[PDB]
Amino acid sequence: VIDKLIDLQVNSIISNDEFRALEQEWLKVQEVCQEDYDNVEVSILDVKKEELQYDFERNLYDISSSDFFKKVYVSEFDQYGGEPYGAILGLYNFENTTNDIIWLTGMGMVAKNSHAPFIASIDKSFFGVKDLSEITHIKSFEALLEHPRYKEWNDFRNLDVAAYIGLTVGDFMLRQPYNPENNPVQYKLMEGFNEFVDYDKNESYLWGPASIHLVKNMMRSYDKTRWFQYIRGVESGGYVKNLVACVYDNKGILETKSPLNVLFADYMELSLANIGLIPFVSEKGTSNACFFSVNSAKKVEEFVDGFDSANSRLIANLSYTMCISRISHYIKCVIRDKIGSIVDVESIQKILSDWISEFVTTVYQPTPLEMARYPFRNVSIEVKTIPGKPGWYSCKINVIPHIQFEGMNTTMTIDTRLEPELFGTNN
Amino acid sequence: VIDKLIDLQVNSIISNDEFRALEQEWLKVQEVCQEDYDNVEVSILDVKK
Amino acid sequence: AKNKIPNSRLMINYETNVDGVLKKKELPYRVLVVGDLSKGRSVDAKKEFADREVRRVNNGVDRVLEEMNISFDFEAPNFVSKDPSNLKVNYRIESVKDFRPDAVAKKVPEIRALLEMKEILASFAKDIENNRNL
Numbered sequence A: 001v002i003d004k005l006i007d008l009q010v011n012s013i014i015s016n017d018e019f020r021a022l023e024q025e026w027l028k029v030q031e032v033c034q035e036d037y038d039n040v041e042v043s044i045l046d047v048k049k050e051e052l053q054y055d056f057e058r059n060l061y062d063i064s065s066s067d068f069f070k071k072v073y074v075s076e077f078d079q080y081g082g083e084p085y086g087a088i089l090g091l092y093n094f095e096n097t098t099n100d101i102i103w104l105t106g107m108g109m110v111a112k113n114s115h116a117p118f119i120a121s122i123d124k125s126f127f128g129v130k131d132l133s134e135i136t137h138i139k140s141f142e143a144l145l146e147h148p149r150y151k152e153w154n155d156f157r158n159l160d161v162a163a164y165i166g167l168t169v170g171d172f173m174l175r176q177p178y179n180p181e182n183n184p185v186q187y188k189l190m191e192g193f194n195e196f197v198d199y200d201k202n203e204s205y206l207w208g209p210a211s212i213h214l215v216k217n218m219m220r221s222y223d224k225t226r227w228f229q230y231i232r233g234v235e236s237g238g239y240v241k242n243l244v245a246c247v248y249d250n251k252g253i254l255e256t257k258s259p260l261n262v263l264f265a266d267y268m269e270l271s272l273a274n275i276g277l278i279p280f281v282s283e284k285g286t287s288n289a290c291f292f293s294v295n296s297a298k299k300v301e302e303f304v305d306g307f308d309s310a311n312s313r314l315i316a317n318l319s320y321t322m323c324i325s326r327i328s329h330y331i332k333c334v335i336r337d338k339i340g341s342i343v344d345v346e347s348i349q350k351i352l353s354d355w356i357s358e359f360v361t362t363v364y365q366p367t368p369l370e371m372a373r374y375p376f377r378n379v380s381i382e383v384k385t386i387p388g389k390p391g392w393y394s395c396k397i398n399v400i401p402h403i404q405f406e407g408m409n410t411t412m413t414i415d416t417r418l419e420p421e422l423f424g425t426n427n
Numbered sequence B: 001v002i003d004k005l006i007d008l009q010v011n012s013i014i015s016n017d018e019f020r021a022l023e024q025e026w027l028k029v030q031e032v033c034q035e036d037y038d039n040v041e042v043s044i045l046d047v048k049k
Numbered sequence C: 001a002k003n004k005i006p007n008s009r010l011m012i013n014y015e016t017n018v019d020g021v022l023k024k025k026e027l028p029y030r031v032l033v034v035g036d037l038s039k040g041r042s043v044d045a046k047k048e049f050a051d052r053e054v055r056r057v058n059n060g061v062d063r064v065l066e067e068m069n070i071s072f073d074f075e076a077p078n079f080v081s082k083d084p085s086n087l088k089v090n091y092r093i094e095s096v097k098d099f100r101p102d103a104v105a106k107k108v109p110e111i112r113a114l115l116e117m118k119e120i121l122a123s124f125a126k127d128i129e130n131n132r133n134l
Helices: A002-012 A019-030 A049-058 A073-077 A100-114 A148-156 A211-223 A266-273 A306-315 A318-334 A345-359 B002-013 B019-030 C103-107 C112-120
Strands: A089-094 A119-122 A166-169 A246-248 A255-257 A277-279 A281-283 A288-290 A376-381 A397-401 C073-076 C087-090
Touching: A019 A089, A049 A100, A073 A100, A089 A100, A089 A211, A100 A148, A119 A211, A166 A211, A266 A277, A306 A318, A318 A345, A318 A397, A345 A376, C103 C112
Parallel strands: A089 A119, A119 A166, A166 A277
Antiparallel strands: A246 A255, A281 A288, A376 A397, C073 C087
């Protein structure tokens, strides 16, 4: 009967707020630093959202004086011996509020300069619904954003800084609740504890933002390959194997519970990519996921001229701005060595090109991984000295990344005109 | 039922004149200085007609 | 920030701005039709001509109809129920199949009284009871 107490005593503080707030805010921290690669050193910075809300909202029109900006740009990226950051990860959930909109506007103001794509997640309060599962009911989010409720948001999608924000939808289950027959608490070598239950039913037992696995794939897409082509699709990047599902015996026979918050359909995968969101879609029953779309919050536009239309399609694509960013981490990092050496217009075009040259091809290699070694297709690098300043220059590169698959239509038909020898008149 | 109060209390001053006169005369000020360009410094001069 | 970050020795920026003229979606070849449909019995028909919002028939003639309150209270010869008073057909049109001599008997309360018996009276099992077999 002492078990009856413990099953009440401990279950009183595990269900308690504040206590399970740290759980959420550490389980999803453990999730990131689970892989441990050869050359991918993560790093923490525990800060309340409000302590940054006040920061950017006070220094939106003076970002260089922002305290955070002075702990990522001018601190490690700018300074000599400093080690620059790469792809920040916002563990927060951002709504459609006109306050949280600034939070992104500021963090992106940093990311844009520090060159570090800021990945985050968006709350279910965005689509104006109290249960994220009920987003499936919305037909097309494309027609949704036309609603005047998103006016402030559509303005932000037009900003340049938004080409570095990458917001994710859906939240993966990060902990299985405690049952004796399922996920038993590892008791002690004598203190019988394994017989210990929890208390949940519908949908309210710990979640974590998809942004984790998104970044935790960018890490993967670096130890294996070297660039960030390997974070999309099933066969290529985002697959995310083996997630923490859940099972429960209400009355039937252990009816499984999908690991993901929401079971996105096919046209949901797409109808979100246009809004500038990253859906974390699940394979029904398979207890797995995959990132089909990896788009920034930047507007895609349309345009009449075909070239212009294609430009905006690649810029919105996050996976490229991750790569183009890695060139900035090459320039402002390596060329710093020869800051005093005597060099020319024809010499800087050598050093900068001789490097990137090993990462540009046209031929395709078997398998995705063996080819994702080569992110770019071709590059131009036209540097040129400026008048007045003798020792100063001004470069201007332009990279065309290997355009990813994105979909296709198809019209099948019985022609009966292909082989006229069987249906023709002459016989 | 405390919501019933607030839905009356605040809604009494948002609909009030003078208060919403500043709104009009600041919302359209924010509208101008929303873009923020590279070399276009606006400037104010609050004066009654 | 308009204040602009202090320039370092190697400032790289990455331009993400794109100019161009936006596209225009095609125009569906609209077809206006004008005829006395409601005979003066509809929400948009009862209003003055200066303000009659044209319909669209996005769905179909079945639902664009039901969108208009087309009812009618015209008299007709009585051959059902008791008491005087000619039969008063009174119901609003939902679908276009309402003029079908069938949906009428389902709508008009009086006629439905005879149809109600044909469900019970005609369903008399004089074939299950007559088929006794010992």
